[PDB]
Amino acid sequence: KEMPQPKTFGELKNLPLLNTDKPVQALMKIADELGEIFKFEAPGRVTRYLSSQRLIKEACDESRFDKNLSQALKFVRDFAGDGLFTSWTHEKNWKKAHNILLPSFSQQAMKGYHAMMVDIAVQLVQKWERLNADEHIEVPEDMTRLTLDTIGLCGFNYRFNSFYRDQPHPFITSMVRALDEAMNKLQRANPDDPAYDENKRQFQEDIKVMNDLVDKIIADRKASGEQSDDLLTHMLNGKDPETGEPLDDENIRYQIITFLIAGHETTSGLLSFALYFLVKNPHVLQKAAEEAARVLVDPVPSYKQVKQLKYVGMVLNEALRLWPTFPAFSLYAKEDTVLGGEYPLEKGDELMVLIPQLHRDKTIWGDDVEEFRPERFENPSAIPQHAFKPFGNGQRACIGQQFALHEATLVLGMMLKHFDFEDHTNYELDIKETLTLKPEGFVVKAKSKKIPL
Amino acid sequence: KEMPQPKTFGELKNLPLLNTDKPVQALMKIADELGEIFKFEAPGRVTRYLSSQRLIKEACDESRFDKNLSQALKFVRDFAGDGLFTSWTHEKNWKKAHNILLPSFSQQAMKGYHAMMVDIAVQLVQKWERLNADEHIEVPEDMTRLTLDTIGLCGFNYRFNSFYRDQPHPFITSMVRALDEAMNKLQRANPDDPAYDENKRQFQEDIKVMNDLVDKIIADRKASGEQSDDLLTHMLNGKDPETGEPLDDENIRYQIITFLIAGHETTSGLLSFALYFLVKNPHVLQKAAEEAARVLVDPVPSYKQVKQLKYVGMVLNEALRLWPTFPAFSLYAKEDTVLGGEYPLEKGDELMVLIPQLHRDKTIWGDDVEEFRPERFENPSAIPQHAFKPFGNGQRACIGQQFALHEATLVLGMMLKHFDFEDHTNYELDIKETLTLKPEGFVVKAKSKKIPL
Ligand code: HEM
Ligand code: HEM
Ligand SMILES: O=C(O)[C@H](Cc1c[nH]c2ccccc12)NC(=O)C(F)(F)C(F)(F)C(F)(F)C(F)(F)C(F)(F)F
Ligand SMILES: O=C(O)[C@H](Cc1c[nH]c2ccccc12)NC(=O)C(F)(F)C(F)(F)C(F)(F)C(F)(F)C(F)(F)F
Numbered sequence: 001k002e003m004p005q006p007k008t009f010g011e012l013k014n015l016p017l018l019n020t021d022k023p024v025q026a027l028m029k030i031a032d033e034l035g036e037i038f039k040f041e042a043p044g045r046v047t048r049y050l051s052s053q054r055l056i057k058e059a060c061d062e063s064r065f066d067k068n069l070s071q072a073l074k075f076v077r078d079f080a081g082d083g084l085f086t087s088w089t090h091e092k093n094w095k096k097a098h099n100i101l102l103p104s105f106s107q108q109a110m111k112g113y114h115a116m117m118v119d120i121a122v123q124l125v126q127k128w129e130r131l132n133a134d135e136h137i138e139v140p141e142d143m144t145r146l147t148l149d150t151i152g153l154c155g156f157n158y159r160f161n162s163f164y165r166d167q168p169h170p171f172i173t174s175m176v177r178a179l180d181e182a183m184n185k186l187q188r189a190n191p192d193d194p195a196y197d198e199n200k201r202q203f204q205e206d207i208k209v210m211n212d213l214v215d216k217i218i219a220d221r222k223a224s225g226e227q228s229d230d231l232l233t234h235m236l237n238g239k240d241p242e243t244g245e246p247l248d249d250e251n252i253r254y255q256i257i258t259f260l261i262a263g264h265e266t267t268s269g270l271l272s273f274a275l276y277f278l279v280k281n282p283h284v285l286q287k288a289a290e291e292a293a294r295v296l297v298d299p300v301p302s303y304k305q306v307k308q309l310k311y312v313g314m315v316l317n318e319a320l321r322l323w324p325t326f327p328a329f330s331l332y333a334k335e336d337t338v339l340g341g342e343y344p345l346e347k348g349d350e351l352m353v354l355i356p357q358l359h360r361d362k363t364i365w366g367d368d369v370e371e372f373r374p375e376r377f378e379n380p381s382a383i384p385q386h387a388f389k390p391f392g393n394g395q396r397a398c399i400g401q402q403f404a405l406h407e408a409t410l411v412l413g414m415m416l417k418h419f420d421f422e423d424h425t426n427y428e429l430d431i432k433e434t435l436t437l438k439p440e441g442f443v444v445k446a447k448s449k450k451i452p453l
Numbered sequence: 454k455e456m457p458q459p460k461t462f463g464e465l466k467n468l469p470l471l472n473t474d475k476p477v478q479a480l481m482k483i484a485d486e487l488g489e490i491f492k493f494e495a496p497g498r499v500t501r502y503l504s505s506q507r508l509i510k511e512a513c514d515e516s517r518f519d520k521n522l523s524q525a526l527k528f529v530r531d532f533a534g535d536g537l538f539t540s541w542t543h544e545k546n547w548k549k550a551h552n553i554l555l556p557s558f559s560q561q562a563m564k565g566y567h568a569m570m571v572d573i574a575v576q577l578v579q580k581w582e583r584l585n586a587d588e589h590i591e592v593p594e595d596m597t598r599l600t601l602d603t604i605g606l607c608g609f610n611y612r613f614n615s616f617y618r619d620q621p622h623p624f625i626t627s628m629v630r631a632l633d634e635a636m637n638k639l640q641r642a643n644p645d646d647p648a649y650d651e652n653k654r655q656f657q658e659d660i661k662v663m664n665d666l667v668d669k670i671i672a673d674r675k676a677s678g679e680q681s682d683d684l685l686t687h688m689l690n691g692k693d694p695e696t697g698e699p700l701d702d703e704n705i706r707y708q709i710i711t712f713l714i715a716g717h718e719t720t721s722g723l724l725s726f727a728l729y730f731l732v733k734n735p736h737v738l739q740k741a742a743e744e745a746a747r748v749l750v751d752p753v754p755s756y757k758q759v760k761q762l763k764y765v766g767m768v769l770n771e772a773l774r775l776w777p778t779f780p781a782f783s784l785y786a787k788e789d790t791v792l793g794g795e796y797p798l799e800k801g802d803e804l805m806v807l808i809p810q811l812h813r814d815k816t817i818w819g820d821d822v823e824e825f826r827p828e829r830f831e832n833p834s835a836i837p838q839h840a841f842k843p844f845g846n847g848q849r850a851c852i853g854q855q856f857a858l859h860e861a862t863l864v865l866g867m868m869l870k871h872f873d874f875e876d877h878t879n880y881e882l883d884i885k886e887t888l889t890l891k892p893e894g895f896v897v898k899a900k901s902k903k904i905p906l
Contacts, residue, residue, distance in 0.1 A: 127617060130614055131614070132611060132612055133673065158585060159583050159584070159585055161584070163617060164616060164617065165618075165619055166619040167619050220586070220587075
């Protein structure tokens with residue numbers, strides 16, 4: 001039985017297929033042509049891309065497969081270290097940090113973060129209230145200002161003040177450039193070529209910038225002793241119940257860098273896609289706006305009011321179905337095993353879960369998988385197990401899921417309460433790929449409903 | 454009596470003395486050397502610089518002298534046109550605009566603008582509340598954000614959104630570059646030298662940017678009929694009592710451009726100098742802060758509360774004494790006349806009033822004229838006529854005087870209510886000159902008192 005494989009480039013095998021600005025979208029097209037599984041080879045490396053719920057449900061069995069660091073994550077590890085996102089499950093610091101931080105990311109914890117989320121959300125709305133008549137909004141740029149500032153503030157009581165700037169904060173410049181470099185390393189044949197020497201030097205300079213700001217943030221909080229109820233305070237004080245150990249300061253840095261990466265890259269994309277779908281589907285926008293108007297009856301939304309925004313939740317989940325913003329995750333076989341009754345795997349063999357394809361599995365979702373329909377999530381127990389995984393799988397799933405959904409629900413709810421929206425350019429979806437997916441160049445006009453804050 | 458005169462450069466006469474980054478400060482030093490009057494010659498022209506109250510009181514006699522357009526103002530007229538600032542007193546549009554606008558710039562008119570002034574002032578306070586512990590404030594840069602935005606909003610219901618940017622608005626970039634070219638054209642031999650073709654092209658392009666935006670603003674408003682009740686509304690509807698004529702749309706544009714020049718340049722300089730002198734004089738800062746705390750008992754300052762900030766007003770007047778931010782104005786003799794019983798002048802002969810030197814006249818102020826003492830203004834009536842002229846003279850005095858002082862008082866009151874200030878760099882005063890004066894590089898730290906808004 002021969003597993004499908006895309007086109008090759010002689011000795012380089014499939015590698016040059018990733019020499020593109022849009023590798024995930026390319027892989028989606030290959031998946032459409034080849035089906036639920038294909039092998040992908042490079043010099044000295046092989047993986048298998050999975051696209052169907054029936055295979056992915058097996059891949060998600062944690063007794064058989066564990067999280068793998070893709071080559072992308074191995075490069076991100078050069079600045080995110082053994083933080084939660086780029087550590088192996090068997091490294092002592094994973095379970096330790098996981099145990100310490102899980103309570104700080106719970107739904108109940110969101111009650112405590114809510115006030116600071118509102119602070120940044122109000123800044124966004126005020127920005128849009130203050131635009132002149134025929135000016136427009138640069139959507140992913142503003143969502144990124146919001147999401148980065150929220151995690152900065154909620155997490156570590158640090159204000160990036162992104163709405164006060166055109167040029168990002170120096171940490172963000174370095175982080176964005178470090179991420180770009182990490183993703184660019186995947187797609188260059190002969191990575192030791194002299195041309196890439198300057199890229200490597202700038203990389204080391206960006207890592208240093210990140211470490212020095214965050215180390216300083218940690219040291220400052222240690223030296224002040226201030227008990228600001230946030231992630232940083234929790235990490236400086238908390239002990240892992242299992243080992244009885246706290247995180248050391250180096251690992252705390254790695255977690256902070258990791259949360260900032262997450263806040264910048266991934267939540268902003270969700271909000272950007274959600275707004276994109278709303279302006280392309282005005283009946284959905286109407287339903288979401290009506291809910292926002294009916295529910296958010298006070299100038300400052302409450303935690304309880306955000307929980308009440310069911311339809312806005314459904315909008316966000318349908319946006320995640322179509323464009324899960326961190327679109328692939330990797331697994332390895334813990335032991336020899338056979339996938340799907342058909343594909344034998346050896347210990348250590350790697351799998352890639354193509355989340356956007358899983359979410360277009362017609363045998364699960366129906367034939368209309370490209371349509372934006374939030375009512376797919378109106379009665380969510382209808383969704384089969386492992387059919388919807390925008391936040392990954394099992395113990396290695398996104399720790400920030402509740403944070404991200406709370407922020408996104410609050411913000412999207414406020415946006416729909418306060419403004420009508422116009423797709424003035426009839427924007428053509430163009431998806432930029434970094435660590436994540438975003439709708440590049442998405443612009444709208446927002447006409448104020450003149451409801452005070 | 455042969456008039457004193459500074460050093461000459463052969464056939465260039467005194468012209469090269471103004472070929473300096475700091476021409477007003479140069480002229481002040483010359484005044485120190487030469488006294489109350491000196492002649493200043495260049496090829497094809499002459500003026501006389503006055504520095505004493507004794508002589509300036511004659512110059513300010515409107516039966517004997519009228520406002521002259523200095524060469525600097527003649528160049529500003531290429532983009533400010535026949536707006537109030539760059540028009541001759543005998544021009545029909547001067548008298549029309551004067552009669553139409555003056556009542557809208559009264560102390561009592563400020564009740565109408567107060568709310569919009571608070572809007573921008575709160576944005577400033579919030580920016581500074583949001584700075585992190587280690588960070589500092591770029592004072593003139595932030596003061597200019599405030600003052601430009603205030604005149605934009607109050608004047609024409611237009612939001613430059615300066616607190617949302619590092620890059621100034623396109624209009625501002627052009628205006629600033631226009632004003633720079635005007636300044637540069639002064640110290641320049643042959644204007645039609647092909648060398649300056651690019652300068653002229655840039656100049657024309659900046660005029661276009663300025664006219665296009667402002668004309669659109671005006672046209673947009675005329676269309677809607679929206680009675681926004683600002684300077685633009687008054688200008689579109691208002692009739693000159695004398696002629697019975699309104700301003701035409703072209704002249705309205707020049708007034709708006711003129712207001713924007715004014716609210717950008719001179720007013721922010723005042724606030725920057727005031728804060729400078731406050732941090733250099735801690736006892737004065739403390740007295741002003743006591744008043745602010747005693748008077749501004751509400752989170753939103755009221756119009757009447759700003760009028761009660763007597764000491765803050767004294768502080769601003771003392772800043773204006775030392776560093777009047779539009780530091781000189783020009784006059785011409787309406788008829789042959791003798792100045793000071795010594796200097797015969799012919800009809801058309803020109804004078805320059807060197808305001809910073811007038812304000813250092815030891816016969817009026819006492820020997821300690823370099824000292825910052827707001828108490829000099831305990832009773833502003835006590836100052837002799839024509840001794841204190843930071844807003845110029847007579848019917849050609851600053852129309853924006855009450856606007857500027859109300860805005861500056863409000864803002865400085867709020868700053869002193871909400872923050873303690875630290876001169877963390879022990880800043881060395883360095884005054885940059887364009888057509889106005891500012892303390893370049895003035896930076897402070899502001900520690901919040903944590904009083905909510
Ligand atoms: C819409 C927003 C987000 C999406 C779609 C998303 C998606 C994901 C996915 C798919 C994974 C699994 C990665 C893998 O298997 O390799 C993951 C892991 C993670 N995410 Fe997110 N994420 C989001 C927001 C956030 C936020 C806001 C934070 C933190 C502030 C965060 C922190 C993390 C961390 C720490 C992990 C690693 C968890 C572990 O292995 O222990 N994420 N995320
Ligand atoms: C600290 C702030 C300010 C200072 C020191 C200042 C100073 C002056 C001075 C000295 C003049 C006389 C010019 C001459 O004789 O050639 C003047 C004129 C003028 N100023 Fe200001 N000014 C300030 C703020 C403003 C503001 C905020 C506005 C408008 C919003 C404004 C509008 C004008 C206008 C229109 C004139 C021309 C008046 C006329 O001749 O009819 N000024 N200003
Ligand atoms: O980084 C990796 O390991 C894998 C695949 C890969 C990269 N190099 C390989 C060599 C042989 C076989 C497979 C690979 N990379 C990808 O699938 C990808 F295309 F880069 C990717 F999809 F864009 C991605 F990196 F996974 C991603 F989607 F951007 C990421 F967000 F990181 F998951
Ligand atoms: O613009 C002018 O006409 C006059 C005088 C002048 C400029 N060029 C001259 C040649 C010969 C004799 C006099 C002059 N300029 C000045 O006095 C000046 F102070 F140098 C000035 F800086 F240019 C100034 F323009 F006056 C000023 F001070 F910057 C201004 F803000 F405009 F008042």
